[PDB]
Amino acid sequence: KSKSIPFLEAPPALDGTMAGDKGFDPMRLSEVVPIQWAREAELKHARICMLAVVGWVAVDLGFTVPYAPQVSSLAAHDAAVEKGAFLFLLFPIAVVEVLAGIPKCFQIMNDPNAAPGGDYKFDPLGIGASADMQEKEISNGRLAMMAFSGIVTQAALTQAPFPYTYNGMSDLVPVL
């Protein structure tokens, strides 16, 4: 029985070696998608959403680079596209993806002796790849995914400052 859903049996592929494992796979994607591919995708989305959340919050608070538009994060995409300097953020993304994801993706698909998904060996400071720091990475990334989804769909809906709620801190704190 899975630890997360106590009325279903966990898949055999999940086991307990992977970081962030909680037996949560009710519809068993792990049989139709390789777990390493799924983990690489999970970590990629998690990292992109962490960066997106912190960048959105910074730009909304007002942290702006010189010569850039002085706009909120909701209109920042359109403003940057109009002003021009937004393809040079795609260019490093282009080289990183084409020269690290495609080879790593084909290694995960084909090679048996390949690094696990989301492992680029990126440890400049040597902080450590412990299983505590992988669990923390995964938990923060999942929280950032949900938080970014909420932030975008609330900012577009309400068109308000940082809280992205209609009333403000009053909705997070009804006592106010």
Partner 1 sequence: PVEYSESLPFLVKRKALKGYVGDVGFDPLGFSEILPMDWLREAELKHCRVAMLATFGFGFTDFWHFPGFDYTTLEAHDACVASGAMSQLLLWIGLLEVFGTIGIDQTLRGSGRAAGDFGFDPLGFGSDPAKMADLQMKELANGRLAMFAFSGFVTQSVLTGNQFPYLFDYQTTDVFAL
Partner 2 sequence: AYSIPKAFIMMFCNVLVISTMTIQGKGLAKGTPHDEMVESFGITWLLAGTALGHIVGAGTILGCSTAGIL
Partner 3 sequence: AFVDSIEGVGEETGNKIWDPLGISDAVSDEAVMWFRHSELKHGRVAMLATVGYMIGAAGITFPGEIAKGVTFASVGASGPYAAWDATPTAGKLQILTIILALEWAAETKKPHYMRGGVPGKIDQLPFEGIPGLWAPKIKFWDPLNFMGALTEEQKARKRKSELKNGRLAMIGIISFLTGHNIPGSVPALDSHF
User: Which residue ranges make up the site for ligand CLA (CB under 6 A)?
Assistant: 54, 136, 140
From residue 12 to residue 51, the character string flagging contacts with partner 2 as x (rule: CB under 8 A) and all else as - is: ---------------xxx-xx-------------------
**For partner 1, which is the closer residue by CB, 64 or 158?**
64
Rounded distance between C-alpha atoms, residue 162 and residue 74, angstroms:
11
Q: Which of residues 101-120 bind partner 1 (CB under 8 A)?
A: 102-104, 107, 111, 113-115, 119-120
Residue-by-residue DSSP string for 101-118: IHHHHHHHHT-SS-PPTT
Are 10 and 25 a contacting pair, CB within 8 Å?
yes
Beta-carbon contacts of residue 4 (< 8 Å; ≥ 6 apart): 22, 23, 24
**Tokens standing for 167?**
């009333």
**Interacting residues toward partner 1 by CB under 8 A:** 98-100, 102-104, 107, 111, 113-115, 119-121
**Interacting residues toward partner 3 by CB under 8 A:** 125-128, 133, 169, 173, 175-176
